[PDB]
Design a protein around this ligand. Structure first.
Ligand code: MG
Ligand code: MG
Ligand code: MG
Length: 49
RNA sequence: GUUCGCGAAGUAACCCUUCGUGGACAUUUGGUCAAUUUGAAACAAUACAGAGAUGAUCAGCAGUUCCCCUGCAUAAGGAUGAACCGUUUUACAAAGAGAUUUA
């Protein structure tokens, strides 16, 4: 269960944010598998953005 | 048909009856509409499917329309009622550069 971040799913994210915008995360974890709302937005705001 | 009155005849004795005539009484309904095929109900059945916002499953209010339906309704429902989701070129110019033609 313990995961780490491929730049694959990371890129799919930044594309997703680049569409749906930040605060719709529950959709951004739909495209993205393996991952959750709080996980997505956690790494986003704390790192990727 | 009633009544008033006149005349005539008969009965009669100023009437009872019959005939004729004058007068009054009484005075214009209804239709926007013909009687089943060809001057207009709408459902149902067959087939085709089989519920907006989303990646997905639902609550919903609205907004516009030469669409309306149910409801006493200025209530509220009818898939949040349905239709919307499509097609998309000119107030048009200014500066610069090359090719062509001409005074
Ligand atoms: Mg309504
Ligand atoms: Mg619904
Ligand atoms: Mg409506």
């Amino acid at each position: 269960k313990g995961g780490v971040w491929t730049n694959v799913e990371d890129q799919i994210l930044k594309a997703a944010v680049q569409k749906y915008g930040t605060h719709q995360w529950s959709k951004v974890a739909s495209l993205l598998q393996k991952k959750t709302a709080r996980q997505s937005e956690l790494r986003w705001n704390e790192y990727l953005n």
